Amino acid sequence: MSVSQQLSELASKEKTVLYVADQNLEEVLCFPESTDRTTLVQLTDACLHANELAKHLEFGKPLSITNQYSRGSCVLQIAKEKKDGSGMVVSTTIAAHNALRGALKCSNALDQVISQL
Amino acid sequence: VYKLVIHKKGFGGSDDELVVNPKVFPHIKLGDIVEIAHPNDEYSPLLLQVKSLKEDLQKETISVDQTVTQVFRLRPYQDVYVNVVDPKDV
Amino acid sequence: MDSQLSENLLKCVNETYRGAMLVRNGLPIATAGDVNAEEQRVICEWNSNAVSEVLHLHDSNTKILIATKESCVLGLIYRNT
Amino acid sequence: RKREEEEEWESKVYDVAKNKFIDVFSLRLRTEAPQRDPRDNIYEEVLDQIDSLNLDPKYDVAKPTEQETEFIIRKLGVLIDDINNIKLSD
Amino acid sequence: MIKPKKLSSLMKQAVEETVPSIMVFTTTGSLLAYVSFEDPKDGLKRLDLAKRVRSIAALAGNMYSLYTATNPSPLVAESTDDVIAHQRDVLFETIIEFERGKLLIAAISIDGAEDKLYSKDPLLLGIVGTENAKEGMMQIKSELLKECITNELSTLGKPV
Amino acid sequence: RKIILMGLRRSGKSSIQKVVFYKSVWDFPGQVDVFDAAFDFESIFTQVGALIFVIDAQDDYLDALARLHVTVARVVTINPNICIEVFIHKVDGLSDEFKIDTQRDIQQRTQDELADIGLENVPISFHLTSIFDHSIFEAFSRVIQKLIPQLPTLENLLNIFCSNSLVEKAYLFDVLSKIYVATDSSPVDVQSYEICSDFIDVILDIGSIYGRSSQLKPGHSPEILDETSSVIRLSNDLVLFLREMNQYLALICIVRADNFEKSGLIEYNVQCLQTAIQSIFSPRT
Numbered sequence: 049m050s051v052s053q054q055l056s057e058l059a060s061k062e063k064t065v066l067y068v069a070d071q072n073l074e075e076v077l078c079f080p081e082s083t084d085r086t087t088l089v090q091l092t093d094a095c096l097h098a099n100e101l102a103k104h105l106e107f108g109k110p111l112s113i114t115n116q117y118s119r120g121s122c123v124l125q126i127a128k129e130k131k132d133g134s135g136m137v138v139s140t141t142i143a144a145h146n147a148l149r150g151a152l153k154c155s156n157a158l159d160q161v162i163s164q165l
Numbered sequence: 166v167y168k169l170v171i172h173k174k175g176f177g178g179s180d181d182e183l184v185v186n187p188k189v190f191p192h193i194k195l196g197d198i199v200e201i202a203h204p205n206d207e208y209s210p211l212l213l214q215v216k217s218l219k220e221d222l223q224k225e226t227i228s229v230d231q232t233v234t235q236v237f238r239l240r241p242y243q244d245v246y247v248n249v250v251d252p253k254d255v
Numbered sequence: 256m257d258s259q260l261s262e263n264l265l266k267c268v269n270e271t272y273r274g275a276m277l278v279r280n281g282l283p284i285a286t287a288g289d290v291n292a293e294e295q296r297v298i299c300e301w302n303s304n305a306v307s308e309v310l311h312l313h314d315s316n317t318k319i320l321i322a323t324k325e326s327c328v329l330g331l332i333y334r335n336t
Numbered sequence: 337r338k339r340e341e342e343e344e345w346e347s348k349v350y351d352v353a354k355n356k357f358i359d360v361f362s363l364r365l366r367t368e369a370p371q372r373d374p375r376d377n378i379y380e381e382v383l384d385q386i387d388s389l390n391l392d393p394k395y396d397v398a399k400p401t402e403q404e405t406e407f408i409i410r411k412l413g414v415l416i417d418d419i420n421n422i423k424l425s426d
Numbered sequence: 427m428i429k430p431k432k433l434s435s436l437m438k439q440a441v442e443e444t445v446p447s448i449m450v451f452t453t454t455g456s457l458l459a460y461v462s463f464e465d466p467k468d469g470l471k472r473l474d475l476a477k478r479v480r481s482i483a484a485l486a487g488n489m490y491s492l493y494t495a496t497n498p499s500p501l502v503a504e505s506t507d508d509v510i511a512h513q514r515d516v517l518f519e520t521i522i523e524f525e526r527g528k529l530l531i532a533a534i535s536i537d538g539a540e541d542k543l544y545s546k547d548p549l550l551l552g553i554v555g556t557e558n559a560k561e562g563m564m565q566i567k568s569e570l571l572k573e574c575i576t577n578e579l580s581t582l583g584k585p586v
Numbered sequence: 587r588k589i590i591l592m593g594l595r596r597s598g599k600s601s602i603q604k605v606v607f608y609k610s611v612w613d614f615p616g617q618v619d620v621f622d623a624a625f626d627f628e629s630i631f632t633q634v635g636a637l638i639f640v641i642d643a644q645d646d647y648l649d650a651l652a653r654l655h656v657t658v659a660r661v662v663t664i665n666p667n668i669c670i671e672v673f674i675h676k677v678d679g680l681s682d683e684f685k686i687d688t689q690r691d692i693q694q695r696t697q698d699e700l701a702d703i704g705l706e707n708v709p710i711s712f713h714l715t716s717i718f719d720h721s722i723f724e725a726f727s728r729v730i731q732k733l734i735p736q737l738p739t740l741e742n743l744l745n746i747f748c749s750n751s752l753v754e755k756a757y758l759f760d761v762l763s764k765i766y767v768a769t770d771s772s773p774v775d776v777q778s779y780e781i782c783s784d785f786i787d788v789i790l791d792i793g794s795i796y797g798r799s800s801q802l803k804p805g806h807s808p809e810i811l812d813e814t815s816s817v818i819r820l821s822n823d824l825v826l827f828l829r830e831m832n833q834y835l836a837l838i839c840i841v842r843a844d845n846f847e848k849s850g851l852i853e854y855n856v857q858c859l860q861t862a863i864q865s866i867f868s869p870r871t
């Protein structure tokens with residue numbers, strides 16, 4: 049069970065949440081299994097609206113949105129579309145100041161394999 | 166709070182004083198009486214009867230005929246309160 | 256890019272270290288030499304407790320010299336052969 | 337014989353301008369909504385049972401000599417001084 | 427009073443080949459001032475560049491305003507509730523990566539007063555990158571431009 | 587194609603061309619009609635797609651209706667693609683009860699004699715015009731909309747632009763004549779149309795006062811000028827804004843100020859509609 053493997057390895061040594069949610073709120077829930085709150089639907093709605101908005105720029109399709117907040121609340125996301133053409137899947141993860149700038153790219157590196165398969 | 170759109174009776178396929186979208190108002194059936202009033206009521210509210218259900222409108226919009234809005238001092242493109250009242254009270 | 260940082264990065268690259276890689280804790284700031292075909296994301300995602308490490312890929316033959324202090328990482332690219 | 341080509345041109349430029357617009361009404365806070373599909377989650381475990389890639393960051397550690405360590409700790413300090421010696425005006 | 431020629435001269439010195447356009451706009455997409463790498467000589471070459479910069483600022487202000495209503499700060503750093511009470515955070519940096527460019531949106535924390543020359547809309551610094559651009563140099567340029575614009579806009583409220 | 591303003595004597599045609607045309611519109615006189623051979627009527631009526639007959643509401647109109655019926659028969663025997671419109675005129679002095687009864691009487695008197703003649707295939711429209719109001723501009727706009735073969739494409743473009751951008755009402759005016767080429771599917775309010783007509787007056791007058799440097803250079807402008815864009819915010823939670831589309835066209839939209847907080851997205855959709863209009867009206871193969 050690779051889900052329990054990453055559920056021990058990406059919730060312990062860097063302390064980040066992981067959401068692999070989508071448009072219709074099929075919640076791949078909190079990987080430390082904390083309280084869910086209302087930040088998931090807000091972040092997923094903002095990411096889908098930002099992925100809709102940034103297609104109209106000249107630079108092309110977005111790969112990632114690295115949204116750094118103050119005093120160590122830095123959030124990175126990667127949005128990828130569904131294979132059956134029914135929407136998009138985001139990959140939300142929240143960390144500290146230097147916790148994102150570091151081993152969080154490992155967590156999104158496993159999460160993009162998850163969103164592929 | 167819903168946006169107030171005006172239409173013309175007999176124009177564009179609309180033959181009623183009130184056009185109610187069923188996907189905006191799922192609790193409104195045929196023959197109901199709909200109270201349309203201003204926020205912070207200055208004038209009398211408007212009561213109209215539902216005679217058709219068309220899905221051409223967008224969300225949070227209710228279509229009233231232009232002369233009915235001109236009689237009741239309803240400004241177009243404004244917020245209105247949409248409520249359903251019993252026929253025995255009015 | 257400043258001129259003194261550009262000449263310092265040119266002083267980083269030589270006939271021994273064929274590639275220079277300057278990077279913050281998460282974001283790159285300066286590149287020199289042959290920095291392509293991965294070998295940059297593994298420097299960006301790198302984090303460890305100690306300060307002096309030597310790393311090479313087990314599916315490649317490129318050896319990287321890595322130092323990290325004051326939230327700034329320097330990477331030197333040279334072939335393991 | 338030439339008006340139909342003009343109509344096809346107007347249809348394809350109408351499709352281009354339809355695809356190039358921005359839906360402002362979809363670009364709002366549709367949150368605080370109830371859940372829709374909380375059951376379809378077993379696809380996550382049956383796809384991520386193994387899928388041949390659960391692999392840690394590799395960076396296979398050899399031990400540094402003191403010459404290269406001294407070289408890189410001398411270089412990183414003056415590069416850090418170059419970073420904090422930056423200025424907007426030249 | 428704000429002088430846009432002063433802002434253009436302040437942002438002209440932070441422009442390299444990998445950073446074509448640096449602009450300052452509001453959260454509603456209203457552009458204040460902008461620069462460019464190459465200065466156009468034709469009129470239409472200025473007009474299409476100004477239209478592109480205005481469209482970039484118009485999309486980037488709404489892309490910042492979508493994320494400004496979300497507080498992810500309680501969902502990290504498990505500690506006491508006084509620390510959570512100290513976590514009244516506002517967004518100050520946003521980096522978006524594309525195939526053929528990069529975009530950085532940073533909110534300029536204007537000094538002087540909380541109601542000096544903005545009606546609850548912070549000025550946003552937009553930095554446009556390319557494929558060869560590096561995101562860490564853009565953050566250094568963003569913090570230098572923010573700390574210079576804030577000192578430049580500290581003398582606001584000009585009289586008569 | 588040309589527009590022919592027919593009618594009888596003292597019907598109001600010269601006042602219509604004083605108000606509209608004088609701030610191809612041709613005014614045939616109230617006498618020497620199609621029975622007279624003073625003009626080559628069959629040559630002119632082939633090239634004319636819109637026929638407008640002006641009928642006075644206050645005066646007796648049965649001789650005017652007979653002249654209109656024989657003119658309709660003449661132009662149908664000349665060409666089957668002509669559009670016929672009836673301009674009921676001089677309704678400024680009439681009451682609100684009088685206009686509806688006059689329109690009902692004129693329409694019932696006309697549409698039954700159309701079946702009595704037998705030319706039921708042709709469409710004949712009816713308009714209530716007055717030179718002291720803006721209804722003559724709206725009636726001439728609905729006349730002009732029939733002649734343009736590109737009306738449903740522009741109307742569908744304005745419909746999807748109003749639905750996407752939360753724009754309440756949109757018009758595509760011509761700034762020289764204050765006649766709107768296209769509008770959306772929602773009805774045209776007279777209170778909206780008056781302020782949309784005077785918005786062009788304010789813009790053109792201020793741009794005539796202050797647009798003196800460059801602008802009207804005889805050789806060429808060394809720098810290409812910006813398109814004229816304006817924004818007016820009102821006190822009743824409504825915003826009017828114009829964007830210059832072509833050298834003679836403009837787009838005035840009515841938007842709530844709640845929806846004008848996201849004015850950048852509306853500006854982007856206005857730019858995309860500008861690209862669509864400039865690609866439609868460009869010469870092509």
Ligand SMILES: Nc1nc2c(ncn2[C@@H]2O[C@H](COP(=O)(O)OP(=O)(O)O)[C@@H](O)[C@H]2O)c(=O)[nH]1
Binds near residue numbers: 601678716
């Ligand atoms: N008060 C008023 N007078 C009108 C109106 N329409 C037309 N008239 C008058 O009626 C006259 C009609 O003249 P007209 O038929 O246009 O002259 P013609 O074109 O040479 O045959 C004009 O001189 C106007 O003064 C109206 O709406 N109100």
